[PDB]
Scaffold this active site. Structure first.
Site, PDB file in Angstrom:
ATOM      1  N   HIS A 240       0.807  -1.204   0.000  1.00  0.00           N
ATOM      2  CA  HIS A 240       0.000   0.000   0.000  1.00  0.00           C
ATOM      3  C   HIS A 240       0.842   1.256   0.000  1.00  0.00           C
ATOM      4  CE1 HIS A 240       0.952   0.736   4.157  1.00  0.00           C
ATOM      5  NE2 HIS A 240      -0.108   1.478   4.425  1.00  0.00           N
TER       6      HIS A 240
ATOM      7  N   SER B  19      -5.875   6.308   9.511  1.00  0.00           N
ATOM      8  CA  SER B  19      -4.464   6.601   9.243  1.00  0.00           C
ATOM      9  C   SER B  19      -4.263   7.659   8.158  1.00  0.00           C
ATOM     10  CB  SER B  19      -3.732   5.323   8.831  1.00  0.00           C
ATOM     11  OG  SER B  19      -3.678   4.401   9.902  1.00  0.00           O
TER      12      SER B  19
ATOM     13  N   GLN C 294      -7.418  -2.080   9.657  1.00  0.00           N
ATOM     14  CA  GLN C 294      -8.590  -1.234   9.876  1.00  0.00           C
ATOM     15  C   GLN C 294      -9.660  -1.697   8.884  1.00  0.00           C
ATOM     16  OE1 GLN C 294      -7.870   3.120  10.625  1.00  0.00           O
ATOM     17  NE2 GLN C 294      -5.704   2.601  10.345  1.00  0.00           N
TER      18      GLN C 294
ATOM     19  N   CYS D  37       3.786   5.623   5.357  1.00  0.00           N
ATOM     20  CA  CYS D  37       3.792   4.441   6.217  1.00  0.00           C
ATOM     21  C   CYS D  37       5.199   3.856   6.224  1.00  0.00           C
ATOM     22  CB  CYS D  37       2.811   3.385   5.694  1.00  0.00           C
ATOM     23  SG  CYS D  37       2.777   1.818   6.638  1.00  0.00           S
TER      24      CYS D  37
ATOM     25  N   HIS E  38      -5.326   5.638   1.427  1.00  0.00           N
ATOM     26  CA  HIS E  38      -4.472   4.595   0.867  1.00  0.00           C
ATOM     27  C   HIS E  38      -4.776   4.210  -0.559  1.00  0.00           C
ATOM     28  CE1 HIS E  38      -5.084   3.892   5.180  1.00  0.00           C
ATOM     29  NE2 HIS E  38      -3.946   3.224   5.241  1.00  0.00           N
TER      30      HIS E  38
END
Length: 143
Positions: free
Chosen positions: A39, A134, A111, A93, A137
């Site tokens: 990701h 977060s 998640q 990330c 993505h």
């Protein structure tokens, strides 16, 4: 059509949208117990952790993060850039160290929105923008 897919129209042009992965494509598109995904995450000022290895303080707005995501998606689809390369460079990330690879996982581990998108992707497929606490993505199912 496969799960989540629906035929849509954007400015007189017919395309296909997946309501689970948010992926959009011109081509007609026609669950696993565990998947492996990579990701590319773009965080924003409202991310649960507005900080990343590439930026002490993430100040971009969510709207700006979305614009960056759409840009990365476009560049990948054009063929000028590869997901791997972009993820290792711009993903907020730590998985960027592994070119965005997150390894294999099952439901109940990531998640929920990321999980739902991940399991709705077929091998080799890339999601559209996916929102979590977060940030935003781009998900690529590799296995």
């Amino acid at each position: 059509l496969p799960p989540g897919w629906e035929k849509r129209m954007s400015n007189g042009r017919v395309y296909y949208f997946n309501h689970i992965t948010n992926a959009s494509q011109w081509e007609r598109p026609s669950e696993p117990a565990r998947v492996r995904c990579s990701h590319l995450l773009v965080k924003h000022s409202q991310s649960r952790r507005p900080s990343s290895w590439r930026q002490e303080k993430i100040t971009r707005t969510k709207e700006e993060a979305l614009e960056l995501i759409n840009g990365y998606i476009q560049k990948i689809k054009s063929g000028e850039e590869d997901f791997e390369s972009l993820a290792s460079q711009f993903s907020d990330c730590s998985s960027a160290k592994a070119r965005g690879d997150l390894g294999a996982f099952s439901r109940g581990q990531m998640q929920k929105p990321f999980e739902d998108a991940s399991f709705a992707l077929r091998t080799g497929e890339m999601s559209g923008p996916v929102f979590t606490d977060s940030g935003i993505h781009i998900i690529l199912r590799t296995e």
